[PDB]
Symmetry: D2
Subunit: 236 residues, 4 copies
Amino acid sequence: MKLARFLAKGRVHQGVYREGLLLDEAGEAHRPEDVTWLLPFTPGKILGVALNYARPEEPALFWKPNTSLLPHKGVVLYPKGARFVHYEVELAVVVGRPMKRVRAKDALDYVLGYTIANDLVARDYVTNTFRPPIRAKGRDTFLPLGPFLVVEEVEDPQDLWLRAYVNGELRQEGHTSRMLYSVAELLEFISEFMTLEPYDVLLTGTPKGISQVRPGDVMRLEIEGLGALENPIEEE
Amino acid sequence: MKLARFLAKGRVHQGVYREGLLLDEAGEAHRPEDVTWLLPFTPGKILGVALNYASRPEEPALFWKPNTSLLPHKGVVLYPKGARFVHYEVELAVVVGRPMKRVRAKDALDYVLGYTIANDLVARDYVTNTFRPPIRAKGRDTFLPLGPFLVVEEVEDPQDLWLRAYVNGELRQEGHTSRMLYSVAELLEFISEFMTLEPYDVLLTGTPKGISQVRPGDVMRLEIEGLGALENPIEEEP
Amino acid sequence: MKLARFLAKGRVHQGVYREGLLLDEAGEAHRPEDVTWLLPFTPGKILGVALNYAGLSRPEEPALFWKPNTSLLPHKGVVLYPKGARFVHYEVELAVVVGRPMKRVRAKDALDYVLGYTIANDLVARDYVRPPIRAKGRDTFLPLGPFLVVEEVEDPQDLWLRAYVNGELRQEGHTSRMLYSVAELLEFISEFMTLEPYDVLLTGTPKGISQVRPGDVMRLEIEGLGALENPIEEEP
Amino acid sequence: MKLARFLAKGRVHQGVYREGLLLDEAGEAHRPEDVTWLLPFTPGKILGVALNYASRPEEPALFWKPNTSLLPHKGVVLYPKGARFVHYEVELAVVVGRPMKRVRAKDALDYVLGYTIANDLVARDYVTNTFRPPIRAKGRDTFLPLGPFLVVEEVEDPQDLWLRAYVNGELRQEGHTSRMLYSVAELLEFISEFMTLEPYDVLLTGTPKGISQVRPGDVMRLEIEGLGALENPIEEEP
Ligand code: NA
């Protein structure tokens, strides 16, 4: 099922998405257009692997602060004066059980589900890969996530198409099978030295392509079987 | 006030440390040796700064420390199996008290709740030149002893505090926060300019280089002017 | 200052209310009409006191009761009227927010532990009136807000209380008439129960013409704390 | 499996109880005697039902227990100074696993995550007919020992479990959940009809009358079929 959270008439609902509608805890159906989308869950810590699409001897891990989190339909703030702001459609993996020293072959047995992430980045602030890209990628609103927490629906995370649209125009396409380090490998590498807890999130990277956005653009990211994450952009 | 959190007889207490004793919410006294020390508060996000002690980096070299690295006073630090170069790092930790976004340096300290001590440990074997210092080197479990107190309304100037580190009771290093390249105010201004800092988020201000290597069996005791002493023994991973 | 929390363009803001304007963390202005009001803070446990307004003596001890966090509703949120209920009433009450841990605190020291104040509408369905949980702890039965007012209230026992239904004044009261003061209540409660920062104490309400019906718009006001407004709809 | 949480060497571990041993997230074993037991999970809101054991009341007599009453296995219960009639209450505790609103009884148990043992203590000295039982009598600090485990996927029928309570090693009472006036399913239906229950919220199902008076110094050990044993000593307040 596709779990979601939304705000309606002052109440936060934890529901399920079916046949284009949101069913709340009481079984009452809601139309997406009538509610205010929220994050499908509350993320613990969020790590991402850079340059993971065609390999490096070790995953180049980076952090995304929770203050960068943004829900579906939320507005991404374009850095004042920036010139090179890109979007990054990526498969987000949500941990379901505590992970510590878990073998790659068992890694998937600990996953709760998946969702869509827009790992934005402002290249203007990146000199090179020497220091962590915190000012360039950990900015407020730079991590739209959702709209759903898809549980027990994805058969293989390494076999999913990835698409991205800007103002409706398909400006990108790709597949996750071309992932240098798999989800199971990333979880194994990470959990060897760091305990991953339920709801922690792993961003798996994105393939290179047309991704520069400007104020006024509406980005729509889609991943096989995970719905579509849409976010407009505006100057700060 | 030196706020502290501890576990005693099954109860978690949010109290205060005074003259050697721990007082709980009701004012009842507890001996440190009879309780289990906990983190003085629950940290939100934690950022550190590399090379911030004595021209300086064009901009603060920020990095992240995961919450799973957190360890309370007296907790056991786990030495990475097979590692050969593990170092402690005595740093002044700054705890945010009010939401910060685009705060000027001259106003930054007005948003600070209090201060505590941090041991920003690093396993240099894992250090690289990609997003340095890498998460695998700085964010291992237990690599962030923090505490024992959340000292509020006591620190006059964060840029005027001595730093000391002991290993097995012997002084290994002496520093002073006046030697900070980027001041606490400048760091908060820099970070809050693009990232909202929420109450209880923590900023690790760096440490001066020294004879900081440690090995299994060693007991690290870090002290900062007016912030007490953070002590942690090191054991080898099971 | 009047602290407030609101949702705007997908972002949750912790700001302040000045001159009819909502200022976010960065100090940027927001028009109330452009945002979605939320609770001014996240409450811990909420206790209320019954019969606290009246040669009859006051109760031998405060008649304490609980309001579940699931009853909480923000300013402008929709209160749900119980199907078939004949006697649903609003209750305008001064809500006290704890700021420091309280255990065995003396009345003379009690107010020193208070963070701030806000308005509460402690709704009740008298039809279902043992702890009145089914009558008082229903979902949406605790509108709370709009602000967490700190460092402004000089004396909690010297504030007027007012309630309007559909813009028409229904009742006027004054906190000086409380049988047990805020200080006495916190002393009584903290004697046996540890109160934590953000726990809330509802101080009661004087009897009045407070019956409400589906379609009604309730606007409660307390001296210096603004106005809390909530419309009522029949349960879906 | 019997889920448990414990503190060891400064670290909070979420483990599993197998063959009298606690295994952490990494699979490493810990001896109980070497760790500090904690609550098996963090409860949301807790509701209890009064007079639920041997027709029946028109509707369940629901009441609240504050999270501040929560106490872990082995924790010390504080006896109210001057109280003359304090009683333990062995009850089956039901832990909600999925959001519940307007759930029918026939489907209720499908929303249950697991079960645990609860000691719903009461100081009868403070009971009257005003919102009975009063919060002052039931909601005192430490008046809700809970645990030691969150037993999931093991209880086949909550209405078919024996209840036992021992004071200082001596059997004080024996009961059975089949004697519940309102079943777990009926209670969750009644409650969820007007109140949304969230994951980790807890329902206390009541207890049968018995010789349950306890005094300072007593060691209470409550047991429920398949849920282990919850033990707590009693001490007088400071
Ligand atoms: Na009331």
